[PDB]
Design a protein around this ligand. Structure first.
Ligand SMILES: Nc1ncnc2c1ncn2[C@@H]1O[C@H](COS(=O)(=O)NC(=O)[C@@H](N)CO)[C@@H](O)[C@H]1O
Ligand SMILES: Nc1ncnc2c1ncn2[C@@H]1O[C@H](COS(=O)(=O)NC(=O)[C@@H](N)CO)[C@@H](O)[C@H]1O
Lengths: 442, 319
RNA sequence: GAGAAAGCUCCAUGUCUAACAACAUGGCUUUCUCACCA
């Protein structure tokens, strides 16, 4: 019916069993209950005692198993007593199934537990979320600016009409200047990060369920938003929600030299979200976004500093583009299961009339590393778990909407910012020379 | 299988040719070790110089095509079954190259085998003005192939489930001559691109697939493989993608007619990477970067990465 | 991609053993087969 793929992975032996954090907060039950309630994840404080009790029972059984194994090893070495060995073997075999079942039940419930919440994260809804700062101002417009979809259809750059038969609902197409603008945006962000020293990386779109669970997303659920391929054609294959999931999978079960840390990887790849607005590019099933994900040093201070640098990069990119953007700290309620600290950057959209969230940065310091066993070995040779920070530099659909609506004009021409001016080759855009398509459908 | 043209000279190497995977692994650009669970089987990761090469090649080809007037375009990744049927690919058969989304979760949703299916969907049931013709648009998107052969060279980068492939799609006038000349132009453009890169290559003509009326196959000589490898496939089509999808173009008279479709591949990151790495292979394992791509990479000669390669701490290791 | 074989290029879960090993199930690494490259 319902079963995790991480416990199955550890049981089969594919990867080392993850190290849970229950022992970390077992010291004070009230603190953990308060943090979990504030996060308001799927698990609730009401159900925490059952998980803790099962864990304690599991620990006692494991200690007993270790003692019996030690006695059996001692008798075996001395003989190398037979009746005692037979009795010990019978006792251990009888106890083993029960211990395995107990472990399965406890780990199944424990996986649901979310990560620690940073004290400086406000508690409340998205509206309750605090605003860090705003760069730029709304452009003055003599007349009401039109919607991005309408401007796109008028210029024929974006085609969203009559697409159900071909691409299904919420499907969009980019043509002409729109396509060049998207390519220019991806290349401009890539070049800026490469100059900053980010190491380019490419991640496969298809990924297995274990990696997704480690990332923290729910791979299979009734309302699940991740696309899963048919089991008959292929088994345990899912479409990457974001590039960071692929990068995490690449880093799963591997070590990095201490000198290399911090490691920054920039990956550009298509992301498919089920997302189960009626029209427009605000909600799209698939889109292309450049993603910067980096694994920092063990120190939490280092992880936070890396997240701050990523935020600075996002701000510099949007300032260069010239869009009006406000950076607001995400609330505890929406932080999510795998995110410690999350920053949301919303770009003003005149046509939409509301700020739109386009960039999200998440500190996965202890959840993703523990789930996938990503660790960094120090010079002495010890292995220390490494914090991972993942953020999105830019998304073509949201940035296209913001740039088009911000630079729209009365004649219908859309101005192009100077940074993308070199890539496009035209200071502005004009009505398409080519005749727009004619619908001949019955 | 006639050889229309042969260009370039085979490189001369004192030492024996080295496989692309070995050169990449020593250089660390591409890792394909114990990636079964993480990314499925026969997937690949490009890092360091390899990623720069992939982005550089796609951007260089895109700039060259745009200079010639190609209208840039992007297509939706998810496509419906009817679109695939029109393009000549059928997912009904058990062995298929088209990934199939779960029917219960979503109905009739299939990943784009190639970018051509997306572009064909764009022109479905629509009429193009007789003056716009011919119309050539270049779309760059990742393409996923459902089945990659494991019988030969399984542990190789040559065949992969997901590869980045620039695709050029061009609609032409009613005349067969128009489509043929358009395809000829496409072939000349791709040949020029290969010559700029410097890869030795031979272009042959495929006899008679069923959807394509005519075909052109470009194979690039790779030293590490030691044998010719197909790198591009441009295949003309005549009133078939349109006649299946009901794609028609309105002439000056206004009569409805079915336009011809020509599809060509500007470049594919995996085969080009193999040929580029192998052709410039050096004694120390370093790979020379052609001057054309020097600006994009920005490094004259690739050297061993300073960062230490990743070690495996997973349970499936001898102890 | 499908099937099959082997243990190495070995790691796990179990049957009789005081216990190594020996045989099973599965993973991984190789090898042998039948098949698509739109
Ligand atoms: N249904 C959607 N359709 C199109 N674009 C979307 C959609 N949802 C979010 N986006 C865009 O994609 C970005 C992804 O941000 S996020 O999913 O919430 N966070 C991540 O993906 C983490 N991997 C960041 O490292 C958003 O900021 C927004 O710009
Ligand atoms: N398994 C594969 N892995 C990576 N690239 C591939 C693969 N198969 C084909 N290609 C790329 O796609 C090119 C054309 O082969 S093809 O997909 O069967 N034919 C087409 O793509 C044309 N119909 C338009 O793309 C190849 O030369 C190569 O560049």
């Amino acid at each position: 019916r319902n079963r995790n793929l991480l416990y199955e992975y550890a049981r089969e032996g594919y990867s080392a069993l993850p190290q849970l954090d229950i022992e970390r907060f077992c010291a004070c039950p009230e603190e953990a209950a308060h943090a979990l309630e504030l996060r308001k994840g799927e698990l609730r404080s009401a159900d925490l005692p059952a998980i803790i009790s099962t864990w304690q029972e599991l620990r006692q059984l494991q200690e007993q198993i270790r003692s019996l194994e030690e006695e059996k090893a001692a008798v075996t070495e001395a003989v190398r007593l037979r009746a005692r060995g037979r009795e010990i073997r019978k006792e251990l075999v009888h106890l083993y199934p029960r211990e395995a079942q107990l472990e399965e039940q406890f780990y199944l419930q424990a996986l649901k537990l979310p990560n620690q919440t940073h004290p400086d994260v406000p508690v409340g809804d998205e509206s309750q979320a605090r605003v860090l700062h705003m760069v730029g101002d709304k452009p003055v417009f003599s007349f009401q600016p039109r919607g991005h979809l309408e401007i796109g259809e008028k210029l024929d750059i974006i085609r969203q009409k009559r697409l159900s038969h071909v691409s299904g609902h919420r499907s969009y197409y980019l043509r002409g200047a729109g396509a060049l603008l998207q390519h220019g945006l991806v290349n401009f962000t890539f070049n800026k990060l490469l100059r900053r020293g980010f190491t380019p990386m490419t991640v496969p779109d298809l990924l297995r369920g274990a990696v997704f669970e480690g990332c923290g997303m729910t791979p299979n659920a009734n309302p699940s938003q991740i696309y899963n391929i048919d089991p008959a054609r292929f088994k345990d294959l899912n479409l990457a929600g974001t590039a960071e999931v692929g990068l995490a999978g690449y880093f799963m079960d591997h070590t990095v030299a201490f000198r290399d840390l911090p490691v920054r990887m920039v990956c550009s790849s298509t992301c498919y979200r089920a997302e189960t607005e009626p029209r427009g590019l605000y909600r799209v099933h698939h889109f292309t976004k450049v993603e910067m994900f980096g694994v920092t040093g063990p120190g939490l201070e280092q992880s936070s500093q890396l997240l701050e640098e990523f935020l600075s990069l996002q701000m510099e990119i949007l300032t260069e583009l010239g869009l009006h953007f406000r950076v607001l700290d995400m609330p505890t309620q929406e932080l999510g299961l795998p995110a410690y600290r999350k920053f949301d950057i919303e770009a003003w959209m005149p046509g939409r009339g509301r700020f739109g969230e386009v960039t999200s940065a998440s500190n996965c310091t202890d959840f993703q590393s523990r789930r996938l066993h990503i660790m960094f070995q120090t010079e002495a040779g010890e292995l220390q778990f490494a914090h991972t920070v993942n953020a999105t530099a830019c998304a073509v659909p949201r940035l296209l909407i913001a740039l088009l609506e911000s630079n729209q004009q009365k004649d219908g021409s859309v101005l192009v910012p100077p940074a993308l001016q070199s890539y496009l080759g035209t200071d502005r855009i004009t009505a398409p020379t080519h005749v727009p398509l004619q619908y001949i459908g019955p | 299988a006639r050889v229309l043209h042969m260009v370039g000279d085979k490189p001369v190497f004192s030492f024996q040719p080295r496989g692309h995977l070995e050169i990449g692994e020593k250089l660390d650009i591409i890792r394909q070790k114990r990636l079964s669970h993480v990314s499925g089987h026969r997937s690949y990761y490009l890092r360091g110089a390899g990623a720069l090469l992939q982005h550089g090649l796609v951007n260089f080809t895109f700039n060259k095509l745009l200079r010639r007037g190609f209208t840039p375009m992007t297509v939706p990744d998810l496509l419906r079954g009817a679109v695939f049927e029109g393009c000549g690919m059928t997912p009904n058969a058990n062995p298929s190259q088209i990934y199939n989304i779960d029917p219960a979760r979503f109905k009739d949703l299939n990943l784009a085998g190639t970018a051509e299916v997306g572009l064909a969907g764009y022109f479905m049931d629509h009429t193009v003005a007789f003056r716009d013709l011919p119309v050539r648009m270049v779309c760059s998107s990742t393409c996923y192939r459902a089945e990659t052969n494991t019988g030969q060279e399984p542990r190789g980068l040559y065949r992969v489930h997901h590869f980045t492939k620039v695709e050029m799609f061009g609609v032409t006038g009613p005349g067969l001559e128009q489509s043929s000349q358009l395809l000829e132009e496409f072939l000349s453009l791709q040949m020029e691109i290969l010559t700029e890169l410097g890869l030795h290559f031979r272009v042959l003509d495929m006899p008679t697939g069923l959807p394509a009326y005519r075909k052109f196959d470009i194979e690039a000589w790779m030293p590490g493989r030691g044998r010719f490898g197909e790198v591009t496939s441009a295949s003309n089509c005549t009133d078939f993608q349109s006649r299946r999808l009901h794609i028609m173009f309105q002439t000056e008279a206004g009569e409805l007619q079915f336009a011809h479709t020509v599809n060509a591949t500007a470049c594919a990151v995996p085969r080009l990477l193999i040929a580029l790495l192998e052709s410039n292979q050096q004694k120390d394992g370093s790979v020379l970067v052609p001057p054309a791509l020097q600006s994009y990479l920005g490094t004259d000669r690739i050297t061993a990465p300073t960062h230490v390669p990743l070690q495996y701490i997973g349970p499936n290791q001898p102890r």
